[PDB]
Amino acid sequence: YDALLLDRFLDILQDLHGEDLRETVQELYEHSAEYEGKHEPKKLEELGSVLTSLDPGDSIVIAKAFSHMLNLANLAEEVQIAYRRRIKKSDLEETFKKLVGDLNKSPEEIFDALKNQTVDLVLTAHPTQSVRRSLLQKHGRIRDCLAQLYAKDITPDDKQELDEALQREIQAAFRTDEIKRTPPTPQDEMRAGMSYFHETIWKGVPKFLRRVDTALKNIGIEERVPYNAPLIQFSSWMGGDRDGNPRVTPEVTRDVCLLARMMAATMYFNQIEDLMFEMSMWRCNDELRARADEVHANSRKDAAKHYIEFWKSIPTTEPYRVILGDVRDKLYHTRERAHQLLSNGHSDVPVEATFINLEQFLEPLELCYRSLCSCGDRPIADGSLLDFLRQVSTFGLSLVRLDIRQESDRHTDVLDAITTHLDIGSYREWSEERRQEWLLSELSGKRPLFGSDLPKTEEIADVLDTFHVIAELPADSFGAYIISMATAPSDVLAVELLQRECRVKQPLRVVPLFEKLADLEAAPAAVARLFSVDWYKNRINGKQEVMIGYSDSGKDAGRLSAAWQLYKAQEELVKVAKEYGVKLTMFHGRGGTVGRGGGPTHLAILSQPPDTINGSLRVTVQGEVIEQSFGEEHLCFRTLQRFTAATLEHGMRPPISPKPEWRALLDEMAVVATEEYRSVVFQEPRFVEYFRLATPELEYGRMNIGSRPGIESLRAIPWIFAWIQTRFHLPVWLGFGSAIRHVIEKDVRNLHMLQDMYQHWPFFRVTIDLIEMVFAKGDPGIAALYDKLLVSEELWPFGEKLRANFEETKKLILQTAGHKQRLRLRDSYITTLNVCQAYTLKRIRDPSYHVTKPAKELIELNPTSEYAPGLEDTLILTMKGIAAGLQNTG
Amino acid sequence: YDALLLDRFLDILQDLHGEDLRETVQELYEHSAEYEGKHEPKKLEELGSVLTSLDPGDSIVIAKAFSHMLNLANLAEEVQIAYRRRIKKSDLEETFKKLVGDLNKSPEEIFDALKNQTVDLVLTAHPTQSVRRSLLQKHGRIRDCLAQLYAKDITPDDKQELDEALQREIQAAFRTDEIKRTPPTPQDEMRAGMSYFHETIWKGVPKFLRRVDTALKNIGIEERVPYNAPLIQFSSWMGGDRDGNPRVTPEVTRDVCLLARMMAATMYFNQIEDLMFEMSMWRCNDELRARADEVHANSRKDAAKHYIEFWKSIPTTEPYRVILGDVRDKLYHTRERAHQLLSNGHSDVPVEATFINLEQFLEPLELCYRSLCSCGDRPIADGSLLDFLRQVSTFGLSLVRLDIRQESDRHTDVLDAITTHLDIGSYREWSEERRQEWLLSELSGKRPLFGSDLPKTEEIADVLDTFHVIAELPADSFGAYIISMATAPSDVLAVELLQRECRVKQPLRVVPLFEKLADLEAAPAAVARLFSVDWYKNRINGKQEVMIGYSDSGKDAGRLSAAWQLYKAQEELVKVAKEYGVKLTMFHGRGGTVGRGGGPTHLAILSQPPDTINGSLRVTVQGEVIEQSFGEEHLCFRTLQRFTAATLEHGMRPPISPKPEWRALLDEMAVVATEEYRSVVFQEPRFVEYFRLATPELEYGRMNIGSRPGIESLRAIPWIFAWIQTRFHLPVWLGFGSAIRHVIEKDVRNLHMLQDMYQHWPFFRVTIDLIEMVFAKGDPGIAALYDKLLVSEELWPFGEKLRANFEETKKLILQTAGHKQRLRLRDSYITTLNVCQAYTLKRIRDPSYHVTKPAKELIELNPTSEYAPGLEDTLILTMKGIAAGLQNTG
């Protein structure tokens, strides 16, 4: 069946570029097959020799071919998973059954805990989505065709039309330039993010809630999940995160907020007419009767011809239609107002004519539900009206609440400008004590701080203006203000003061971001010191959120030491919050790749310390993971399923707490791991030199994914990207070798204790299992090829040293997990691209192949390329394709 | 499986009204089962005795129950047909194969004939749709649930959720008042009609064309049906037909025209963004390159924030996106202009900013298609772009072209006002010759006729103002001007002159309506006399359309005589048109019921005389038939399939022409039939008396279906309705008895000639077979019950006489067809309603049961009822239910 895609695609490839190129692709496929089979490292050079002959356009077409074959492989994989799972006629029903049988927990305990559980998924525009949106659509159509094909209810003509359809959709995908020729704007990122709503999430949330209702009824709970129960919520960073991104201006935040508001209004308006058509009952309570009579009083006996349906005044015979008719009016004016507010700078639509409250909207629909239930129509109410109720109470008036993130030093610059202009000192030079006392005196004082005549920099005015934009916009449009590089209470209080001083009517909650290992070590102390400030603890209202970054932790220290320190951090933060009677919810800045704290969602949630969630979880979805977990109905459902199940289990089934021997053992193990990591990534003075040559790191910025314009000083995303492209995975497994070897060296029974830990401690089991997965996607022969082709003859053995540790570390991993279904084949395509990526890099770093109208062929697609005509496009294509094959970018 | 619906519905009925009423419904079902089985006429009285006991509310609930059970039976029937047809893995592919094998016709002949073939389906608001739209939606949801259930890919939870869904949707249907409490406005009729577009037709037309493409490729024709080839078109009467309907004012026509235009604009706008996303190619011709460069010149470097997607200026890298971007702009302004024009009386949107031409729209899309084909992307072009092309060239800027219909006497009144005010005579008193000469002198003259100071009646001003409204609106928004009761060329020329004189820039074609038998007899002579007028034949441009009514023909004369005269009419009209070298297209005013010329569509088309269509057909779809043939994807497809196949076959496979012995035989047979018909329906002086008592005719107007406020002087719709409710079908079979008996009496070999005619002449075969179908839906015991319960003891034998002829006629029908799968059961429910309808009529026509806030029970739903509280609702419910069971209203 794997041969099917090969057949169809290669047929189209021959129909587009001839037999010769299809035969050369087939040769490359056969060489790569002999490599992923026999594993002879000579086969790689045998393949590269064939790759050198390729013309400038032909090499482009080859990279194109293997890239699209990898994409098709991903789509067929998704179809086969969805069907293989569907033909069974963790999981929600299974989780409920296990919670009842195993742990003796009762249905009402599961229902009660589930009512009070919340999962806040926040989508980010982190530049990890390699495939452009113009192609993502075509992939969606192709997986639709393949899903409809993988079935036994095909009527011959339908199958033929799907053949023509899949053929034309592949041809259309292959006929689009996969290369972003300009990087996006932040608004473009926010559109790419929100597109999953008016395509999947909007209908996916009500369906998922209905399924939860079904499961609860399969445990004996006739009751239904409350429509206003917040089981899942959505936040966004798109247009809000300005940390290190000067292109995210205040006008950008205004733009994305108004945008989201207009989208929400449009969706509700499209729904409301069909809902009005269904609510055709004539029985209601005395309550809904009285209200509908009120609306019919001010019914405006007018033509009302701007609508299509129900343009005549709605009779009181159908009262639900009266009330929903008023909801439609306020929806129409809400949409038109947001449309003008966005299109121009203003609107004449009266605010009283729109929905201003989150639940001015909800009130009439709630009334309809009470009416239907009182009159015996609970089945009807639990249908489209319940779907709509859940959509309102889940998406509100602005589809997603927007977070604003900014580094602490920018707030410090602002305050320093304020104290210098006020002739009271320099806030920068002040100690922490002084900053705290001053900020407190101003927060509790009543006199304004700065004035119109405060001297501002473009940066200072940037942050002040973002605060004014926050003040001008509705409160329910924003989420949290996240402080990057937050270290002291003065960093939070600075934001509270700048908010209050910028006349932010309803100030949003402040949340610190601890991402570097040093900040994670000292985080509980800082949070405790903040809660010690009685003013802040009294204004925090017993609830605090703090963000815990995962990207940078495993970059400066070992991955093992980073994970372990993260566990300690969560644990002691909960300790502090409990010590101050504050409900702490922790915001996990997880990635898609294990190197940035990624991995399977339920495994990541299981590897959290116990009693640290408590029905309140907040997780990032890094750009590319959005597509991974919401591009199809089934994907979206499996996502919300996975999250809510893992949280509920982690609430009622607490993971085992580590034995103290395991605590000290992991402390020692972490020390050895960190020394082993920094030994090779920072102590070696030639390491950065070898890295900038053996990996395609430097070229990452050429993909133009995001809108953001030594090794310690680079972003973690291209850091993981470099070692995953080469399939070496250094940042995933580095410290583990020396760690384990030292732990068995110091004591031989520590082997029995490692075996003991892998079979009982969820955190350790998940860590080791992830490392094993990452090893299963690794092949050191690739890194060997990159060294042989791109690294100078001098420090060739350096890489070999690494190659040693790799295998050594792998030997230890399987030794702890106790290990020694036949997918493979895709690694063949990937291998070809690996070779193509290596040789092309060699031709890129040369002088001869450097530079000293319309387009009718691929080579004319890059006229402003500093490198040779056909080369740059080929390199970008190789990166895209390899990322697709590995199902991860960074 | 029939028991399934009974189970589910009766479960809900018990959950809504208790065991007692469910048991009484079950008793009624069992009595009706013993009646439709044993056929004992005592069982009917046995059932009515049970019906008399019912409380006022309970009888309402019983009629409700059997009505909804009949509706569910219809839906299950539709599902079972669609699946039973789908599990085969006339018809298009079969028709092609037969045209090749049987008749030796070649593929290019079928393709050429199919290119030049047109089928114009015109939807009417004729008051035959008994079920209100508020309930029609619920039926749609219920058939969706039942369709998804009738399958073997159900995953347990999906099946349970569909159980809850179908339960709540039945409960919602049963919880709506099925009774229209006020009759609709014409605009409401036009909305009900157009709703099938933005639900089924809009996506159904491209799919159907794709299927035709598939069939053509299965004959070896790689070519595709031209996007602009007009295989199917849609016209409307909703808001245009004012014949006898004073509520269809000129403002109504303006309203429905602007409405339709705004709907079309909205649909195109919703499509255009997704089409823009797909057309992401970068290769184009020099032509499309030059045009896209033109658009990028006047690109308006602006924010363009009113859009959601593509708000940035579209780069020339993707030229299809540039051009489709301009199409989107003109679509946005077209929609906004029509929206303001409708909402207010005017718009500030410049006309140059919108699409004014039918193919100003088409030009850029045509260019995109030429580009894709030239660059090798014909597969891509034959996808969404082809779907969109076909939708544009099929629906245009206003979804349907509107017809205006008006009776001739109103034009005559206008002209008489004009000649009297001009002091030149009285146009009424003028002979035909004089009217022709005068009208010709004015049409060819250049001086204006009437002025501002012409004295007008409300009627005269009605028609003049409809002409001004026609002049004010775009030409492509209107279809034809149909003249009711048209008898002379002066009737057509009057409309041509009134149009020209009301400054109708592009005057619409005039078409006469011959519906009464007298007018059909003299139609060819009148058309020939019209073509004799050289001025009109020179302005007609070789094309003429004439309408042929079917409703009134079978009302004043026999059904057989009516059908036969219709055949003669078509035949001699074609003779005249060929004699004048005019391409005649005939407009068949067919109904849904056989009594109004209804029946299966392919059978009606086959019963047309040969060489009378010639790739040009125009057929009405009477109100209720719209729902019958477009309420589901499958129904819509089977409809367009049936029509286009029947027309193509009737073009290449001409039906046999009648032998002259059959001509004279049918002439005699028609004379005997007409005398037999008028003998009982007009000669009998007590006939009208017996009719107004034995049938529920008089109560028809109580259903409030349409917006239109002796027996010769009633409408044909309630005429067929009365005899189908009682299941007697008098107007379908009346003349056939005496006709056949006289034909075998005059000559015994005429029996062998009838046997000869039934096996070779398609018109006769269809006629007899239809009569046999109508007999299969008849039961004279019902009419016997109505007589026994409602007809005075005096003329009881009169009905029995009719009952005699019934059986007698039936004996003859099966004797000609040579006749002597087990659905039945539904006739049980119908029978119950029959009984309920009879006894209730008896209680309605009494003095004791006559009349001399909110609502919380069914009896309070009618507070202004002249009859007893619970009675009127029960009668209306019985009519609705019986019509549903018989699948026909009138």
Burial class (CB in 10 A: 0-12, 13-18, 19+), A651: buried
- Asked whether the beta carbons of residue A305 and residue B343 sit closer than 8 angstroms, the reply is yes
Contacts of A311 in chain B (CB under 8 A): 187
Residue B150 CA: distances (Å) to CA of B9, B156, B172, B326, B630: 17, 14, 22, 46, 21
Closest Cβ–Cβ partner in B191, B282, B306 for A339:
B306
Q: Bridge-partner residues for B2, per DSSP?
A: none
Asked whether the beta carbons of B706 and B798 are under 8 A apart, the reply is no
Give the Cβ contact number of residue B1 at 10 Å: 7
Give the Cα separation of B333 and B265 in Å (integer).
Answer: 9
Q: Give dist(CA A320, CA A329) in Å, integer.
A: 14
CA distance A675 to chain B (A): 51
Q: Which of A83, A214, A280, A342 best probes binding to B when mutated, by most B CB atoms within 10 angstroms?
A: A280
Best residue in B11, B262, B282, B641 for a mutation probing chain A (most A CBs within 10 Å): B282
Between chains, do B157 and A380 touch, taking CB under 8 Å as contact? no
- Could you tell me which chain B residue has the CA closest to the CA of A209? B161
* Structure tokens belonging to residue A764: 């350790």
Closest of A564, A755, A578 to residue A666, by C-alpha: A564
* First-to-last C-alpha distance (Å) of chain B: 31
Whole-number Å distance between alpha carbons of B310 and B269 = 14
Under 8 Å between Cβ of A411 and A419:
no
Contacts of A552 (CB under 8 A, 6+ apart): A515, A516, A517, A716
Q: In which element (H, E) is residue B830 found?
A: helix B826-844
Contacts of B289 in chain A (CB under 8 A): 854
- What DSSP letter does each residue of A41-65 carry, written as one string? THHHHHHHHHHHT--HHHHHHHHHH
Contact A168 B382 (CB under 8 A): yes
- What is the rounded end-to-end Cα distance, in angstroms, of chain A? 31
Q: Count of CB contacts below 8 A, A vs B?
A: 139
DSSP assignment letter at B405: E
Using the structure block, give the residue that is written with the tokens 């080579």: A859
Q: Which amino acid is at A330?
A: K
Taking CB atoms and an 8 Å cutoff, what residues of chain A touch B172?
Answer: 278, 280-281, 377, 380, 383
**Pairing between strand A118-124 and A616-622?**
parallel
CA-closest candidate to residue B594, choices B636, B630, B626, B554:
B554
Beta strand spans in B590-627 (E):
616-622
* Nearest C-alpha in B relative to A310: B188
Contact call for A171 and B343, based on CB within 8 A = no
Chain B contacts of A177, Cβ < 8 Å? 280, 282, 317
Q: How far apart are CA B810 and CA A549, in angstroms?
A: 87
d(C-alpha B184, C-alpha B237), whole Å: 15
d(CA A739, CA A679): 13
Give the C-alpha separation, B885 to A737, whole Å.
80
- Tell me the shortest Cα–Cα distance from B188 to chain A, in angstroms: 9
CB pair distance less than 8 Å for B280 and A172:
yes
* Nearest alpha-carbon partner for B414 in B451, B463, B358: B463
Spatial contact of B875 and B702, defined as CB atoms under 8 Å apart: yes
Integer angstrom CA distances of residue A789 from A706, A870, B169: 30, 20, 68
Broken C–N links (> 2.5 Å) in chain B, after residues: 89, 709, 820, 852
Inter-axis angle of helices B780-790 and B687-694, nearest 10: 100
How distant, in Å, are the alpha carbons of A445, A497, A534, A667 from that of A440? Answer: 8, 9, 10, 39
Is residue A660 a contact partner of residue A761, using CB atoms and an 8 Å limit? no
Out of B141, B177, B342, closest to residue A305 by CB: B342
Using the beta-carbon criterion (under 8 Å), do B161 and A309 form an inter-chain contact? Answer: no
Residue to mutate among B142, B209, B380, with most A CBs inside 10 A, is B380
* Listed resolution, Å: 3.0
Are residues A708 and A125 in contact, defined by beta-carbon separation less than 8 angstroms?
Answer: no
Reported as half-sphere exposure (CB side, CA atoms, 13 A), residue B533 has a value of 23
Distance CA B882, CA B700 (A): 13
The helix/strand/coil state of B88 is: coil
Closest CA to A571 of A705, A663, A665, A493: A663
Sequence length of chain B is 890
Cα B397 off chain centre by: 22
Task: Indicate the SS3 state at residue A583.
Answer: strand
Cβ contact A176–B309 (<8 Å): no
Contacts 24+ apart (CB under 8 A), A777-780: A777/A727, A777/A729, A777/A886, A778/A727, A778/A728, A778/A729, A778/A806, A779/A727, A779/A827, A779/A831, A780/A728, A780/A806, A780/A807
Considering only CB atoms, which chain B residues are within 8 Å of A255? 305
Q: Do residue B89 and residue A191 have CB atoms under 8 angstroms apart?
A: no
Name the closest residue on chain B to residue A83, using Cα atoms. B153
- Residue type for position B116: N
Contacts of A175 in chain B (CB under 8 A): 280-283, 377, 380
Q: Could you confirm whether B39 is annotated as catalytic?
A: no
**Using CA of residue A274, residue A278, residue A282, residue A285, what is the dihedral sign?**
negative
Residues 6+ apart with CB under 8 A from A474: A261, A356, A397, A398
DSSP states of A756-794: HHHTT-HHHHHHHHHHHHHHHT--HHHHHHHHHHHS-ST
DSSP state of A657: P
Q: What is the DSSP letter of B502?
A: T
> What residues in B contact A855, CB-CB < 8 Å?
282
| Contact yes or no for A28/A6 (Cβ under 8 A) | no
Interface test with chain A among B168, B288, B384, by most A beta carbons within 10 Å: B168
> d(Cα B574, Cα B571) in Å, to the nearest integer?
5
Angle subtended by helix axes B660-678 and B559-579, to nearest 10: 130
Residue A618's closest CA among A60, A30, A121, A78? A121
**How many Cα neighbours within 13 Å face the side chain of A593?**
35
Q: Do A185 and B138 touch (CB under 8 A)?
A: no
Phi/psi for B119 (5° steps) reads: -135, 110
Q: Give me the count of residues in chain A.
A: 890
Among residues A31, A43, A64, A126, which one is catalytic? A126
Interface contact flag, B137 A277, Cβ < 8 Å: yes
Cβ neighbour number for residue A626 with a 10 Å cutoff: 23
Identify whether B126 is a catalytic site residue: yes
Here the tokens at position A685 are 């003075």
- Is the CB of B278 less than 8 angstroms away from the CB of A380? no
Residue of A nearest to B309 (CA): A191
Test B191 with A854 for CB contact under 8 angstroms.
no
Contact B181, B705 (CB under 8 A): no
Instruction: Describe the crossing of helices B56-86 and B871-886 by its angle, rounded to 10 degrees.
Output: 20
CB atoms within 10 A of CB B240: 32
Residue indicated by tokens 């429509």: A227
Dist. CA B574–CA B756, nearest whole Å: 27
Asked if A106 and A601 count as a contact pair (C-beta separation under 8 A), the reply is: no
How far is the C-alpha of B287 from the C-alpha of B292, rounded, in Å? Answer: 9
Least Cα distance to A227 among A360, A388, A100, A96 occurs for: A388
Distance from CA of A282 to the nearest CA of B (A): 7
